[PDB]
Amino acid sequence: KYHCHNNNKKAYDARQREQTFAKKKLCIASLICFVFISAEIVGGYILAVVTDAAHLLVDLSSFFISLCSLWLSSKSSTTRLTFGWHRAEILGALMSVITIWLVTGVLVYLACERLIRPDTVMLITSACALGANLVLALILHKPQTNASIRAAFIHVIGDLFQSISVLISALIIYFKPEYKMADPICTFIFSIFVLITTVTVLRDLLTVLMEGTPRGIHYSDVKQSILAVDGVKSVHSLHLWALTMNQVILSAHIATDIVGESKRILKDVTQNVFARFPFHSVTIQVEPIEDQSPECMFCY
């Protein structure tokens, strides 16, 4: 009694732990961020206007989309969306990365306008921003890393460079009142670095959305595993795609010389395929060797 669902539990329990573990850190980070929100209010009474609220507001806002997607991803499979809502944490994480591009562009425009209209508080604001951001970096931070932690961490550590830039600009100005042109150019030399560290995340997250082969698995390795069976002769129209970052699905065709005894081949191939990676699901068809064609364009 070899049911085809026997090996699917390996990728079921591993996923369950990841979403519970991920929900633990964001809730801790959200509360820690909320504590530092009240610090600005306390300082407002005792100067009063500080721009740290804008940076901290989007950070807390970016920590509610990910919790919402993780809360939403637990829904049951339906007639529509047959695979389930398990891809909702890719779209949820993509919106977080988009915020970094939009936020940076706004600050570039404000820094650019300093040229046409040139003009202790700077030091204290930079210290608070560089303190809160650095703390959350450590709090946030074999199977590949979660698609949501890999986005929230980039958001927190991406904006740490902006706090570095203002500290350098304020320190130079406070010691040298002249050469005020360094402040507008200080942001430009550091605004690019935020746009560079978010490139390896966009590429690793965009190929999933167009059902490309995910990192950690190889097309050539999987093809060799199937061919180890004696019965199989050739594989065509192989298909690998990742439903999420650490869940993969397989689909293929298999050609065998013997028209009969096809029941035995399915048990051996499915067992051999699962002995290399925990697959979310696998669907393997069997075609007799007579039905193969030499020069089909779809076959290649």
| Residue 255 · residue 238 · CB < 8 Å | no
Q: Show contacts with a copy of itself in window 263-282 (CB under 8 A).
A: 263, 266, 281
Terminal-to-terminal C-alpha distance of the chain: 36
CB atoms within 10 A of CB 132: 22
How many Å apart are CA 204 and CA 246, to the nearest integer? 12
How many Å apart are CA 155 and CA 56, to the nearest integer? 11
Binding segment for a copy of itself among 13-21, 30-38, 41-49, 252-260 (CB under 8 A)?
Answer: 252-260
Q: Which is nearer to a copy of itself, 38 or 293 (CB)?
A: 293
204 binds, among Zn ion, a copy of itself, none (CB under 5 to 8 A by kind): none
Binding segment for a copy of itself among 22-30, 118-126, 161-169, 289-297 (CB under 8 A)?
Answer: 289-297
By CB under 8 A, name the one of 147, 170, 232, 284 that touches a copy of itself: 284
By CB under 8 A, name the one of 3, 24, 142, 203 that touches a copy of itself: 3
Radius of gyration of the chain (CA): 26
* String marking each residue 264-293 x if it binds Zn ion according to CB under 5 A: -----------------------x-----x
Binding segment for a copy of itself among 27-35, 45-53, 193-201, 253-261 (CB under 8 A)?
Answer: 253-261
Which among 72, 111, 105, 100 has a CA at the least distance from the CA of 88?
72
How many Å apart are CA 19 and CA 142, to the nearest integer? 16
* String marking each residue 231-260 x if it binds Zn ion according to CB under 5 A: ----------------------x-------
Which among 25, 5, 2 has a CA at the least distance from the CA of 283?
5
Q: Show contacts with a copy of itself in window 86-125 (CB under 8 A).
A: 87-88, 91
What are the two backbone dihedrals, phi and then psi, of residue 286, each rounded to the nearest 5 degrees? -125, 130
**Residue in this structure with the two tokens 């393997």, named with its chain if needed:** 284
| Axis-axis angle for helices 10-45, 149-158 (nearest 10) | 30
Residues in contact with a copy of itself by CB under 8 A are 1-5, 8, 79-83, 85, 87-88, 91, 206-207, 209-213, 219-220, 237-241, 243, 251-253, 259-260, 262-263, 266, 281, 283-288, 290-293, 296-299
Q: Give the residue ranges of the annotated binding site.
A: 3-5, 55, 59, 86, 155, 159, 236, 253, 280, 287, 296, 299
